[PDB]
């Protein structure tokens, strides 16, 4: 199945205390592999999955340096933004950056990303063609015009189309053991009588990887949406994931409903039926 | 025995292409950000483009936005710079250079290579022997030379006796006369008593006109 | 893009301190702790002497130091030496590009004045055989770096066919320059002899060759 690599960066001003808090993480699909935290002791990019630990000293020195420069750029960015939005030095503000790339099952390039938020709203993003920009509003138009003149996209594109995917390739290869495993979900169904007249049927999907999953309800073999709760996929905390789906059903009708699970780890999708 | 060695650069017409290569040796090339920095005569260092590591690279100076393209092939320890639509502005020595790590700066340099962008014709030099004087012939010392006459682009290279003779050689900075051509002269100053014992040949090289010449300087 | 900005030229005496400012914006030098300085000696590639604002590469001498304070970066050289006379360039990361500074000229004051040694050649037999003719004047080892070269044929001055150089700093920190006089074989012989006179500091020194 397909794969990605994404870095996420976050800075948060804190006028009165020191410099902005800067937090950066890198992921390959759903596995975080590097982190940097301006507030931590070591002042270094640190490993977070066994397979990146293989990289030699020059990697760590280099990545530390590059992540530092990201942070220092965000530092300037906070200010320039404060300015464009005539905001006072008093308030705390947040910049957020994310970029990276997707490849298909053949590891050939598929899509590139680069985007930028100010105080929790878009600000500027590189369109899907990696050749033009979307400015979220009028202030961002100043950036877009700057970055157009500066041929910024051209550089971004070469990275995303090339360097990004080559490194993703390397990572996947080196991380074969873990990253291209697929963990089928362990599935079961629970039943709780909500009253004399109703009962909840909850369909569980535990310990799976990747995080991409679909749980759907059916009644008499037709897609069932009404009276359905479905929660956000959540990390188990040991590298795998959980989700659940529930329907409330009239008591005595439990046999009509079936739960359907699809996940790349499963040769054919599962159907579960309350199993009295 | 670090060594960046620039090639692929001579004379080119306005609007032309040129593509510079840089064969690299004695440091782990894939650890280094690689870059070009150029230096027009009389003038200061520029910075043309750089490529990284690893991830990172490429970026380009605003004066070369979209004319120039940097590239690297580690399986070859070589760095490339495609240069199109060259204007006169782009006339300079181009240096191949490395950085030991990101944002370090250039800590490994080449010797430099010369790019002239011009419509003027490439002319090959004449080499004449500048022969020694007889009064010079006391104890002390004697002056003997090579006049490398009328050449287009800089540079010319002059060794003596296939670069075995090093001591008291002075190759002179060249002149640019209004003809738009250069002359220089290398001179060696040797003891008078060895005018009659040693042999003196100057080896003139002008890569852009294929003008290699060995001139014997012998007492008239 | 743009700039950096260093004094055109700073000078000092042996043993003294000298400082070369290098000033930018909150956006490069004020933006990041990635300033480096380079040293470049005449007709030799640049060499890196500082990086990361303050670090010296293993190699470079103890009396060089970097610093920065706001948008200006500085290089102090203390206990100045002859072989420190050279050009220096700062240089900074700026997020999306690198940018060198405009470069400074470091000098070492009160060197002894040095008189030019002038050699002059006549046209080569072989040039005269090729219907052309050049008198070559080579002036070198002179300090400070200023000379005027006046040619004289027979005794009258000759303004025409004279192309002299600007003086270069030789690697010994003295200077060298040269003058070529272009005649035809006819003019060369129409005259008893020719002098290349070379003036440096109010004193003249001259050499003569005859057909």
């Amino acid at each position: 199945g397909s794969h990605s690599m994404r870095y996420f960066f976050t800075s948060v001003s804190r006028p009165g205390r020191g410099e902005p808090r800067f937090i950066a993480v890198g992921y390959v699909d759903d596995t975080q592999f590097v982190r940097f935290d301006s507030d931590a002791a070591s002042q270094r990019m640190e490993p977070r999955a066994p397979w990146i630990e293989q990289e030699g000293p020059e990697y760590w020195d280099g990545e530390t340096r590059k992540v530092k420069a990201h942070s220092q750029t965000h530092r300037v960015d906070l200010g320039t933004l404060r300015g464009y939005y005539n905001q006072s030095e008093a308030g705390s503000h947040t910049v957020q950056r994310m970029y990276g790339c997707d490849v298909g099952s053949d590891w050939r390039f598929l899509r590139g990303y680069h985007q930028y938020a100010y105080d929790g709203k878009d600000y500027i993003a590189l369109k899907e063609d990696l050749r033009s920009w979307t400015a979220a509003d009028m202030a961002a138009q100043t950036t877009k015009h700057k970055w157009e003149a500066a041929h910024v996209a051209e550089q971004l594109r070469a990275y995303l189309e090339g360097t990004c995917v080559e490194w993703l390739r390397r990572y996947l290869e080196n991380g074969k053991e873990t990253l291209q495993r697929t963990d089928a979900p362990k599935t079961h169904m629970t039943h709780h009588a909500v009253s004399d007249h109703e009962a909840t049927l909850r369909c569980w999907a535990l310990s799976f990887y990747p995080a991409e999953i679909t749980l759907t309800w059916q009644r008499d073999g037709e897609d069932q949406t009404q009276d359905t709760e479905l929660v956000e996929t959540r990390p188990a905390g040991d590298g795998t994931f959980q989700k659940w789906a529930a329907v409330v059903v009239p008591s005595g009708q439990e046999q009509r409903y079936t739960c359907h699970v699809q996940h790349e780890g499963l040769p054919k999708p599962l159907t579960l039926r309350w199993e009295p | 025995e670090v060594q960046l060695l620039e090639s692929g650069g001579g004379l080119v017409q306005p609007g032309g292409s040129l593509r510079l290569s840089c064969a690299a040796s004695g440091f782990t090339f894939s650890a280094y950000g690689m870059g070009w920095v150029r230096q027009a005569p009389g003038k200061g260092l520029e910075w043309v483009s750089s490529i990284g590591s690893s991830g990172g690279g490429t970026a380009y100076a605003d004066s070369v936005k979209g004319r120039f393209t940097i590239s690297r092939d580690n399986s070859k320890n070589t760095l490339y710079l495609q240069m199109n639509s060259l204007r006169a502005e782009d006339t300079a020595v181009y240096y191949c250079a490395g950085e030991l790590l990101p944002y370090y700066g250039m800590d490994v340099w080449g010797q430099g290579t010369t790019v002239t962008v011009s419509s003027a014709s490439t002319k090959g030099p004449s080499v004449f022997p500048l022969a020694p004087s007889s009064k010079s012939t006391s104890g002390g010392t004697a002056a003997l030379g090579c006049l490398v006459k009328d050449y287009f682009p800089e540079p010319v290279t002059v060794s003596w006796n296939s670069g075995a003779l090093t001591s008291g050689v002075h190759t002179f900075p060249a002149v640019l006369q209004s003809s738009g051509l250069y002359s220089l002269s290398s001179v060696v100053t040797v003891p008078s008593s060895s005018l009659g014992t040693q042999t003196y040949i100057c080896n003139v090289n002008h890569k852009p006109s294929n003008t290699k010449v060995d001139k014997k300087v012998e007492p008239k | 893009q743009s700039e950096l900005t260093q004094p055109r030229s700073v000078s000092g005496s042996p043993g003294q301190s000298v400082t070369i400012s290098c000033t930018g914006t909150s956006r490069d030098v004020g933006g990041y702790n990635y300033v480096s300085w380079y040293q470049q000696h005449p007709g030799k590639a640049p060499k890196l002497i500082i990086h990361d604002v303050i670090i010296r590469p293993s190699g470079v001498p103890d009396r060089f130091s970097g610093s920065k304070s706001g948008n200006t970066a500085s290089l102090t050289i203390s206990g100045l030496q002859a072989e420190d006379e050279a050009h220096y360039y700062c240089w900074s990361f700026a997020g999306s590009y690198y940018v060198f500074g405009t470069g400074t000229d470091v000098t070492v004051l009160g060197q002894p004045k040095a008189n030019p040694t002038v050699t002059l050649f006549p046209p080569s037999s072989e040039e005269l055989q090729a219907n052309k003719a050049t008198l070559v004047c080579l002036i070198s080892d002179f300090y400070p770096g200023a000379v005027t070269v006046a040619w004289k044929a027979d005794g009258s001055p000759v303004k025409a066919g004279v192309e002299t150089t600007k003086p270069s700093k030789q690697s010994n920190n003295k200077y060298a320059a040269s003058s070529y006089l272009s005649l035809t074989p006819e003019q060369w012989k129409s005259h008893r002899s020719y002098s290349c006179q070379v003036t440096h500091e109010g004193n003249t020194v001259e050499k003569t060759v005859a057909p």
Binding site: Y7, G26, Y59, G62, E63, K66, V67, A69, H70, T73, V76, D77, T80, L81, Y99, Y116, Y123, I124, T143, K146, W147, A150, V152, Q155, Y159, T163, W167 | G33, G52, S53, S54, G55, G56, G57, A59, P102 | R27, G31, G95, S96, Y97
Partner: peptide, 9 residues
């Protein structure tokens, strides 16, 4: 491996 060049806004 991170981008080396980050453009300011």
């Amino acid at each position: 491996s991170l981008l080396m060049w980050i453009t300011q806004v």
